[PDB]
Amino acid sequence: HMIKVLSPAKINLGLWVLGRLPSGYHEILTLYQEIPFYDEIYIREGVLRVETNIGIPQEENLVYKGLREFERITGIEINYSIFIQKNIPPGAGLGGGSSNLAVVLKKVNELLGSPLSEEELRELVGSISADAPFFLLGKSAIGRGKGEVLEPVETEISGKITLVIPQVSSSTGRVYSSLREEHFVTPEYAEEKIQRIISGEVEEIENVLGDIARELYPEINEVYRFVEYLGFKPFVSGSGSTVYFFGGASEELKKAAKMRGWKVVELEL
Numbered sequence: 351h352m353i354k355v356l357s358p359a360k361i362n363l364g365l366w367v368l369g370r371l372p373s374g375y376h377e378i379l380t381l382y383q384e385i386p387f388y389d390e391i392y393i394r395e396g397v398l399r400v401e402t403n404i405g406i407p408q409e410e411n412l413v414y415k416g417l418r419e420f421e422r423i424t425g426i427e428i429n430y431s432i433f434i435q436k437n438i439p440p441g442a443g444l445g446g447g448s449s450n451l452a453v454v455l456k457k458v459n460e461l462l463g464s465p466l467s468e469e470e471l472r473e474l475v476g477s478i479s480a481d482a483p484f485f486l487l488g489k490s491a492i493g494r495g496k497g498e499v500l501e502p503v504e505t506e507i508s509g510k511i512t513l514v515i516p517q518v519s520s521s522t523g524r525v526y527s528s529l530r531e532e533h534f535v536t537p538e539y540a541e542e543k544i545q546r547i548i549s550g551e552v553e554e555i556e557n558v559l560g561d562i563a564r565e566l567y568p569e570i571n572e573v574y575r576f577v578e579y580l581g582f583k584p585f586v587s588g589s590g591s592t593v594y595f596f597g598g599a600s601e602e603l604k605k606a607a608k609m610r611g612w613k614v615v616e617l618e619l
């Protein structure tokens with residue numbers, strides 16, 4: 351009884367770090383935007399299994415963790431064989447893993463008569479990824495706290511957006527480790543910026559994790575510089591590696607990408 355579900359990516363339309371929390375760990379402000387860029391997930395009745403087309407081991411897979419935890423918290427034994435075709439590259443700063451977790455858990459929770467409630471499902475996926483509960487609502491939301499405290503917003507942003515993803519996998523942990531006092535802003539500063547972005551002022555986007563990721567991973571910087579050369583303002587999603595801009599891909603971009611092994615994703619918002 352196999353079904354297919356799409357699992358969307360996000361971009362961060364701006365990110366600010368307010369400071370360190372005892373638990374690791376950083377308080378942030380960000381604007382999440384869902385983008386029409388999807389992993390395809392085939393769910394079939396069978397023995398619990400989570401496979402991808404890109405060799406993520408089952409034990410490492412957020413979706414598998416999530417479904418084992420579902421078993422724990424619910425006392426129901428899950429009989430679903432999961433295959434995920436990963437178009438959203440891990441380490442691209444687009445929340446593909448967290449998306450997979452949220453959508454699969456939401457689906458399996460329905461397919462099993464809805465044992466968990468909206469707030470529980472959210473606490474479950476949220477426990478694994480701070481990221482992950484944005485994907486239970488989608489569209490556009492402000493993330494506060496560590497990204498889990500969400501406020502749905504209506505954005506005045508539309509038209510072409512292009513993603514340029516280099517074949518470096520940004521380690522978010524290594525990015526947060528280059529953070530210094532100098533990178534933090536006040537929440538009031540960030541809230542004014544986000545308001546402006548929400549009203550369609552894309553030039554107000556900025557992200558210190560991107561600034562850092564460009565220093566640590568020279569290839570992110572190479573893409574950034576290339577996008578400027580092409581005559582667009584570049585921006586960085588998550589803590590990289592993705593660079594995006596508000597325009598279309600030229601043939602010269604497509605050529606540079608094929609040659610360098612960058613993925614170019616043209617979308618419309």
Ligand SMILES: CCOC(=O)CC1(n2cc(C#CCNS(=O)(=O)C3CC3)c(N)nc2=O)COC1
Nearest residue numbers: 374375376378480481496497522523526588589
């Ligand atoms: C143990 C030390 O490492 C960390 O805690 C850094 C990490 N982190 C991650 C956070 C997050 C989040 C979700 N929003 S987001 O768009 O994906 C943003 C790119 C992080 C966060 N708010 N604070 C953090 O400190 C854990 O994943 C990166």
Ligand SMILES: [Br-]
Nearest residue numbers: 529530531532
């Ligand atoms: Br610091």
Ligand SMILES: [Cl-]
Nearest residue numbers: 395396397431
């Ligand atoms: Cl079978």
Ligand SMILES: [Cl-]
Nearest residue numbers: 518567568569
């Ligand atoms: Cl690099």
